Amino acid sequence: KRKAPRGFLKRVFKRKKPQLRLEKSGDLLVHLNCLLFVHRLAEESRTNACASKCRVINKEHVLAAAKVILKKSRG
Amino acid sequence: AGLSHYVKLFSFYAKMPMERKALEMVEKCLDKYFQHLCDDLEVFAAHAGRKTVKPEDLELLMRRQGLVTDQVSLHVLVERHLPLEYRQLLIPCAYSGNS
Amino acid sequence: TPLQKRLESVRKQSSFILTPPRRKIPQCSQLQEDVDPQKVAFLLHKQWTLYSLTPLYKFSYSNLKEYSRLLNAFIVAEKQKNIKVIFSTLLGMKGTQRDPEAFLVQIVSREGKVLWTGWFCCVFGDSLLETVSEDFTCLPLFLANGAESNTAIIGTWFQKTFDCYFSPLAINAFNLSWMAAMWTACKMDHYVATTEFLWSVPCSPQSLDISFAIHPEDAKALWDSVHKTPGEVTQEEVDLFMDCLYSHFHRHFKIHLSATRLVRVSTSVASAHTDGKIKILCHKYLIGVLAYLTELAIFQIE
Amino acid sequence: MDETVAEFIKRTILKIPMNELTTILKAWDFLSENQLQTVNFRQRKESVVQHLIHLCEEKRASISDAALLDIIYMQFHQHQKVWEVFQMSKGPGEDVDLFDMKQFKNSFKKILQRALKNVTVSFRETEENAVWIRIAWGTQYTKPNQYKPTYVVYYSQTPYAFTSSSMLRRNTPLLGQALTIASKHHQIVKMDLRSRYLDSLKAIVFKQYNQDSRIIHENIVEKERVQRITQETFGDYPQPQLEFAQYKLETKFKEPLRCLIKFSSPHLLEALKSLAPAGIADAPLSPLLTCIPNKRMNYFKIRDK
DNA sequence: TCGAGAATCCCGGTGCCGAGGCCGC
DNA sequence: GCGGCCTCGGCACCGGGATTCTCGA
């Protein structure tokens, strides 16, 4: 996949928090943040899959991935 | 939509088949990711004293996420993942008219 | 001379003029020159799946690194459709000085987990050298052992770059009985394994297999019963050894083993199958076992 | 829901194929009727092997019933893990008036944990009246190993007690010993019948298997004869031995000439039956080869006589 | 003479590629 | 009920257990 939605990230940044002034390409920075967050998710979930030696990512690996990376990606 | 964009990009980022039931939970992970981010941009932009969220307002946040370092600055991180027509907006090129 | 010699060879072979190859008992082949003891010893007790390899056009034993890269970049690309390829000249797997030096093709995966370990050898194969031009470095034998998938990929690469073609060498039960006889005729000591002959009867509904495994010293004493002329084993001597097996099996179980076909003849020298997964090389007679195997590969090529 | 138990259940649940998932999961009783609907058995292998084991995480699965799962898996896959046949022998006297399945379970577990103190013996009294013992071994120095268990199919009051020939360790003389002391016998003997098809070993050791006008065939008087002699040695519906029916010959060639014959067929006694009519074999087909079920033996050790 | 150590015969317990099944056009 | 998809499983090659048989208590 070679895309990054201009409209969706702006709509999310406005829906979730109504009071900001995200800059001209600040939503592009938000997309980069989510791209790298999902990078960390993919790689550490691959690590989680190798932890239980499961050849398919499942729910029990993603929930363990979340509490590590999502907490780590908190500012 | 965009969450569906990221779960599809997860497929080409995990390099490995997963389950749809995994994807709606990673959807809640992205929702909480924004539920931490947009108020982390909130508090970081308030820390700078500026109403708007300038690019350096997020460079500090990504320093917090450990992805910006003295070795890996903000702009280099744009090289590795964003497409050219998108990083043309972010990292200043030069025409004697640097963006 | 450059082709017409091969045409006359084809004429001689197709003529089938009194074939019975009275063969010299495989002589103890003291390991010639280098023959890397670690490499050769690693190459002995590995179940080589034989193939017949036509001569390689425009091959050189100097450009091993270039072929190594060209094939490594092709194998991992067949995964796109972690792996290292080490072409390694063996320097001693040759019968006469004029034979092409045998060279390896190893799919080395991190550590030295050799996945595939190909092997092209041309020993005592001077029935092909004197008929092919200089540009071709002919190695009739190809030895797989890696998965059939990787063999059917390196074979395609070799076809693409060298115009060499891999027919899977199938040792017929006649040649199998021959080698089963000259390997119990050898002068070895401390027999590693029993002399087993895996027969396979031709029943249409069922597929019963027989493992006529003889004590290796007991088969040597049975061979001496039918061995009269020394130095060379004849077709009649081989047939009498095989018929003494037949008359010790039909004697016992009243089923004519001669009505069945050999599928595998395990011997202390070298195991040998039919369907291709043939040559285990237990002892260091491999320059003689490989001599027979290359002579058989000429039969398929020529 | 434990070490070497939850993942053991996982390793025995990916073993069982997708078709008979209901069949084996219904019989081992941890998943009641209500629990079957929760997991969609038809979706995926890793999905079911993850949701089912969770359904035991809530059910706090223990090795006592995890081993029963393996038993029920093998009851439909007994055609693997080639089986030895043990034959008990009481001396002179009355039979075992007390084979109480409770008492036999006690008299087997007690004797086995007397020496092999760490073993997980799990019985399953089948409906064909044949206790299906499964033994996970391990010495006092180690935990009971469920990786390579030794299932023992002891027919309840029968002198014959099949055994999964897993490794043939020092427990095999204790496997026979505990078997012959739990059931009130005195001598345990390996019958040396070793076949992969327990449903055929059951037949053998119990003797339960037999109970154109233009084409002028000149050797018709011989084809009729060979068909006759292959019908008085192989009567009807032979059972598939499918086993390496060894004949460790020690005979002189006509001092001895050692041989280790191994007939190997997916269906042996039928392959021999179609030998003589196919011209491979003589009509009287060497009772060594016909009397495999008649002697209840295939791992022969013949000599000269 | 006998008791522990190593090697190796006998057969697993594992690895891994064709066969059968199965879901869009 | 087929198209590119996928999953069991026979065959087979490589890894420890007990029998040989050599050496120490």
Swiss-Prot record, chain A:
Pfam families: CENP-W. The keyword Lipid biosynthesis does not apply. It is found in: Nucleus; Chromosome, Centromere; Chromosome, Centromere, Kinetochore; Nucleus matrix. InterPro entries: CENP-W, CENP-W/WIP1, Histone-fold. One of its GO terms (molecular function) is protein heterodimerization activity. Highly expressed in ovary, liver, lung and pancreas and to a lower extent in breast and gastrointestinal tract cancers; such as those of the colon, rectum and stomach. Overexpressed in high grade breast invasive tumors. Expressed in many cancer cell types. Transmembrane segments: none annotated. Keywords: Cell cycle, Cell division, Centromere, Chromosome, DNA-binding, Kinetochore, Mitosis, Nucleus. One of its GO terms (biological process) is cell division. GO terms for cellular component: chromosome, centromeric region; inner kinetochore; kinetochore; nuclear matrix; nucleolus; nucleoplasm; nucleus. Its main location: nucleus. It comes from the Eukaryota. PANTHER family: CENTROMERE PROTEIN W (PTHR34832:SF1). Belongs to the CENP-W/WIP1 family. Heterodimer with CENPT; this dimer coassembles with CENPS-CENPX heterodimers at centromeres to form the tetrameric CENP-T-W-S-X complex, which is a subcomplex of the large constitutive centromere-associated network (CCAN, also known as the interphase centromere complex or ICEN). Interacts with NPM1. This is Centromere protein W. It comes from Homo sapiens. The lineage of its organism: Eukaryota, Metazoa, Chordata, Craniata, Vertebrata.
Curated annotation (Swiss-Prot), chain B:
It comes from the Eukaryota. Signal peptide: none annotated. It is found in: Nucleus; Chromosome, Centromere; Chromosome, Centromere, Kinetochore. Component of the CENPA-NAC (nucleosome-associated) complex, a complex that plays a central role in assembly of kinetochore proteins, mitotic progression and chromosome segregation. The CENPA-NAC complex recruits the CENPA-CAD (nucleosome distal) complex and may be involved in incorporation of newly synthesized CENPA into centromeres. Part of a nucleosome-associated complex that binds specifically to histone H3-containing nucleosomes at the centromere, as opposed to nucleosomes containing CENPA. Component of the CENPA-CAD complex, composed of CENPI, CENPK, CENPL, CENPO, CENPP, CENPQ, CENPR and CENPS. The CENPA-CAD complex is probably recruited on centromeres by the CENPA-NAC complex, at least composed of CENPA, CENPC, CENPH, CENPM, CENPN, CENPT and CENPU. Identified in a centromeric complex containing histones H2A, H2B, H3 and H4, and at least CENPA, CENPB, CENPC, CENPT, CENPN, HJURP, SUPT16H, SSRP1 and RSF1. Interacts (via N-terminus) with the NDC80 complex. Belongs to the CENP-T/CNN1 family. The largest part of the sequence forms an elongated and flexible stalk structure that is connected to a C-terminal globular domain with a histone-type fold. The gene is CENPT.
Curated annotation (Swiss-Prot), chain C:
The modification Phosphoserine is found at S15, S29. GO terms for cellular component: cytosol; inner kinetochore; nucleoplasm; nucleus. It comes from the Eukaryota. GO terms for biological process: chromosome segregation. Its main location: nucleus. Component of the CENPA-CAD (nucleosome distal) complex, a complex recruited to centromeres which is involved in assembly of kinetochore proteins, mitotic progression and chromosome segregation. May be involved in incorporation of newly synthesized CENPA into centromeres via its interaction with the CENPA-NAC complex. Component of the CENPA-CAD complex, composed of CENPI, CENPK, CENPL, CENPO, CENPP, CENPQ, CENPR and CENPS. The CENPA-CAD complex interacts with the CENPA-NAC complex, at least composed of CENPA, CENPC, CENPH, CENPM, CENPN, CENPT and CENPU. This is Centromere protein L.
From Swiss-Prot, chain D:
The modification Phosphoserine is found at S213. It is found in: Nucleus; Chromosome, Centromere, Kinetochore. It holds the Pfam family CENP-N. InterPro entries: CENP-NAC/CAD_complex, Chl4/mis15/CENP-N. GO terms for biological process: CENP-A containing chromatin assembly; chromosome segregation. GO terms for cellular component: cytosol; inner kinetochore; nucleoplasm; nucleus. Keywords: Centromere, Chromosome, Kinetochore, Nucleus, Phosphoprotein. Belongs to the CENP-N/CHL4 family. Component of the CENPA-NAC complex, at least composed of CENPA, CENPC, CENPH, CENPM, CENPN, CENPT and CENPU. The CENPA-NAC complex interacts with the CENPA-CAD complex, composed of CENPI, CENPK, CENPL, CENPO, CENPP, CENPQ, CENPR and CENPS. Interacts directly with CENPA. Identified in a centromere complex containing histones H2A, H2B and H4, and at least CENPA, CENPB, CENPC, CENPT, CENPN, HJURP, SUPT16H, SSRP1 and RSF1. This is Centromere protein N. It comes from Homo sapiens. The gene is CENPN.
